């Protein structure tokens with residue numbers, strides 16, 4: 001009965017509801033293009049749902065020693081992020097008709113970001129944990145850079161309806177994403193200042209906003225047709 005279970009349960013419910021909702025709305029639409037967005041967008045919270053349910057039931061948590069103590073690390077988060085973050089980027093890539101190579105680089109960078117983040121989370125030498133964290137954050141900044149400069153520019157060539165929608169989704173992604181590394185740094189994976197129960201609350205808020213919130217904005221717009 002870990003203190004943060006209440007947030008894992010709240011996260012489970014929200015990802016679950018969002019999943020079903022997007023799924024229903026998705027299966028009713030007939031437009032080929034919109035169907036693509038709905039599929040990608042529905043899968044995201046569907047995966048988050050399964051990982052959150054897993055954590056709620058006691059999986060994806062391991063004790064890692066560093067700083068002279070045993071620290072609880074939820075590695076299941078990375079299993080979630082490994083697949084969801086690139087799908088979210090895919091959504092944006094499709095919305096602005098980004099080039100194949102740009103997509104590859106983004107997903108690749110994303111892989112580096114999640115992968116190094118996990119190694120960092122499992123590293124036993126306190127100082128090295130932050131080396132991986134920095135490597136990971138740098139990869140994240142490359143992603144946000146391309147989204148902000150590269151994608152926005154690509155968006156300008158689209159109709160104002162698509163560009164505007166992209167901008168909202170872009171802003172939401174930059175704000176929420178730029179926060180993860182800060183939570184990691186001050187939470188149980190980093191300095192251990194914010195306790196795991198509040199940290200789980202923070203990630204849940206960021207996760208729901210970045211997936212279901214993102215989905216609601218995207219799937220409710222005409223930019224997907």
Ligand SMILES: *C/C=C(C)/C=C/C=C(C)/C=C/C1=C(C)CCCC1(C)C
Nearest residue numbers: 117136137140177180181184207210
């Ligand atoms: C639904 C989940 C989303 C949109 C998660 C996004 C997660 C990130 C942008 C995570 C970034 C991290 C770093 C930059 C470094 C430290 C470790 C991570 C994996 C928390």
Ligand SMILES: CCCCCCCCCCCCCC
Nearest residue numbers: 127128130131133134185191
């Ligand atoms: C030989 C050890 C080298 C360590 C380099 C660490 C770089 C850390 C950057 C983040 C620091 C966060 C402090 C809270």
Ligand SMILES: CCCCCCCCCCCC
Nearest residue numbers: 008009010012013016053056
């Ligand atoms: C004390 C009992 C808490 C039960 C919390 C349930 C949260 C949603 C679970 C959904 C499983 C599909």
Ligand SMILES: CCCCCCCCCC
Nearest residue numbers: 105108109135138139142
């Ligand atoms: C995908 C091409 C650009 C890759 C940038 C990688 C940055 C890694 C920092 C650790």
Ligand SMILES: CCCCCCCCCC
Nearest residue numbers: 112116127128131132135
């Ligand atoms: C792909 C780039 C990998 C960089 C690894 C750095 C490890 C530092 C350990 C102290």
Ligand SMILES: CCCCCCCCCC
Nearest residue numbers: 119123124125128129131
């Ligand atoms: C690119 C190769 C990076 C190798 C890192 C090795 C780290 C060893 C820590 C004990």
Ligand SMILES: CCCCCCCCCC
Nearest residue numbers: 127130131133134135137
């Ligand atoms: C021993 C002092 C190490 C300071 C590292 C600063 C790294 C800045 C870029 C992450």
Ligand SMILES: CCCCCCCCCC
Nearest residue numbers: 127128131132134135138
């Ligand atoms: C002990 C300090 C190790 C620093 C490794 C930096 C790797 C940077 C890869 C981009």
Ligand SMILES: CCCCCCCC
Nearest residue numbers: 026027035039042046
């Ligand atoms: C066209 C709707 C696709 C839905 C895929 C859902 C996967 C959970």
Ligand SMILES: CCCCCCCC
Nearest residue numbers: 115116119122123124
């Ligand atoms: C992918 C690099 C992993 C390094 C692990 C080092 C464990 C001492």
Ligand SMILES: CCCCCCCC
Nearest residue numbers: 186193194195198202
């Ligand atoms: C948003 C930062 C919260 C910090 C809580 C610290 C409790 C010791």
